């Protein structure tokens, strides 16, 4: 399946958001199998009725089938192997596929209307290959050059740069801190500027 992509800033690097309806449609045979195994459905007609009714118990089994089953995400022009990587899906509320901000550079995918195709590996061989070779954490360095490709992009680079600046005169300049913890305590309490020449 496919949908418009969306930045998810609350995602860990190994996981990606997946809409309820796309996940429910893609993993339909897995849901049927788990429903029959748990005995909650006797005939496949009942299982289809539950999955189409979206009964509250079908979300539990959907979560179980999604827990450790990676999925594949790729952009339209895949110019290199990095253009399709495996993500461990997490159920989200909507119709768009949530992407980790740090993998956009590898995908060459901004959020101005891009779409992504999602594929579900089935065989244990396929799942293990997704998790061990093409999981998003495995491919940090670019295959073209050992330099990393999962690196901070525009906004996070701006944040990190602004954090680590220096002001000639700022609130909280001069005193010494016994640990990084005291620095955090002083900054969050508002007694020291974010960029003030201090000792620690």
């Amino acid at each position: 399946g496919r949908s418009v992509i969306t930045v998810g800033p609350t995602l860990r690097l190994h996981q990606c958001g997946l809409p309820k309806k796309m996940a429910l449609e893609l993993f339909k045979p897995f849901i049927f199998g788990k429903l029959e195994g748990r005995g909650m459905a006797t005939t496949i007609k009942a299982a289809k009725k539950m999955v189409e009714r979206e009964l509250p118990e079908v979300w539990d089994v959907l979560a179980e089938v999604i827990r450790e089953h990676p999925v594949l995400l790729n952009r339209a022009p895949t110019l290199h192997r990095l253009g399709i990587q495996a993500f461990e899906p997490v159920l989200i509320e909507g119709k768009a596929i949530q992407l980790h901000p740090l993998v956009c550079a590898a995908y060459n995918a901004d959020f101005d209307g891009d779409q992504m195709a999602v594929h579900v590996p089935l065989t244990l061989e396929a799942q293990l290959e997704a998790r061990a070779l093409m999981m998003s954490t495995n491919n940090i360095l670019s295959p073209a050059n050992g330099e990393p490709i999962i690196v901070p992009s525009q906004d996070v680079v701006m944040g990190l740069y602004y954090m680590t600046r220096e002001a000639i005169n700022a609130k909280g300049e001069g005193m010494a801190f016994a640990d990084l913890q005291e620095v955090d305590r002083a900054y969050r309490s508002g007694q020291a500027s974010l960029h003030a020449r201090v000792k620690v």
Partner: protein, 236 residues
């Protein structure tokens, strides 16, 4: 969440779905509500003629129009994921075919509207002429007032004649059949209205080529707010 609560970017989408009564080899398919093996609630949503009443909320898979083709069912149902409100139904019937009840009701409504339009159009002009004539003569010579009364009566009669001629012309322009494709007995189409709300994934843009796909819809509290307390609506 205000931009959704204030319902600013919601839009109305109208889509149509069609059914054609083919001249099937065994026989013509008829637009009948007695679909074979049809459930009751779905038939309750339908009418006696086999067409959904205008103004009915329709979920996915519901049966909008009922066609029986020899008896197999060619009844129209909405595509998966498509849910909306029926706003209009149109019926076209081939020349020499029986005009069903729904087409009769639609036509009588149309001629009622037309009749009332020319009725009020006659009313305004006749009132204007009558008050002009009454203002011309003194409060209630003698030849002039009678001549003007006769002229006003003649004008009113001529207007009535041309108006009724136009009404009859519109009537007969309504009673005619359609030039449907060969093998089309009756053609029906239904119109569905959907209020599409803005949701994460919708593409939004400005006027200077600044595209964007809406990411999340945070509540009013989280958005940055001025010292006066007014909250921002969009953070770019």
């Amino acid at each position: 969440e205000r931009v959704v609560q204030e319902d600013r970017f919601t839009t109305i989408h109208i889509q149509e779905l069609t059914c054609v009564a083919r001249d099937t080899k065994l026989g013509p398919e008829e637009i009948t509500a007695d679909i074979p093996n049809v459930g009751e609630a779905a038939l309750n949503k339908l009418d006696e003629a086999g067409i959904v009443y205008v103004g009915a909320e329709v979920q996915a898979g519901d049966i909008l129009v009922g066609k029986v083709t020899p008896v197999k069912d060619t009844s129209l149902r909405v595509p998966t994921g498509t849910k909306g409100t029926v706003i209009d139904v149109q019926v076209f019937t081939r020349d020499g075919v029986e005009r069903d009840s729904r087409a009769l009701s639609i036509e009588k409504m149309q001629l009622d509207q037309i009749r009332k339009d020319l009725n009020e159009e006659f009313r305004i002009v006749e009132g204007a002429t009558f008050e002009r004539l009454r203002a011309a003569l003194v409060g209630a010579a003698d030849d002039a007032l009678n001549e003007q009364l006769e002229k006003a009566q003649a004008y009113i009669s001529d207007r009535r004649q041309l108006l009724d001629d136009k009404f009859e012309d519109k009537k007969r322009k309504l009673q005619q059949g359609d030039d449907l494709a060969p093998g089309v007995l009756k053609i029906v189409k239904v119109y569905l209205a959907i209020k599409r709300r803005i949701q994460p994934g919708d593409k939004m843009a400005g006027r200077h080529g600044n595209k964007g796909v809406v990411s999340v819809i945070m509540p009013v509290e989280d958005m940055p707010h001025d010292a006066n307390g007014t909250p921002v609506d969009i953070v770019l």
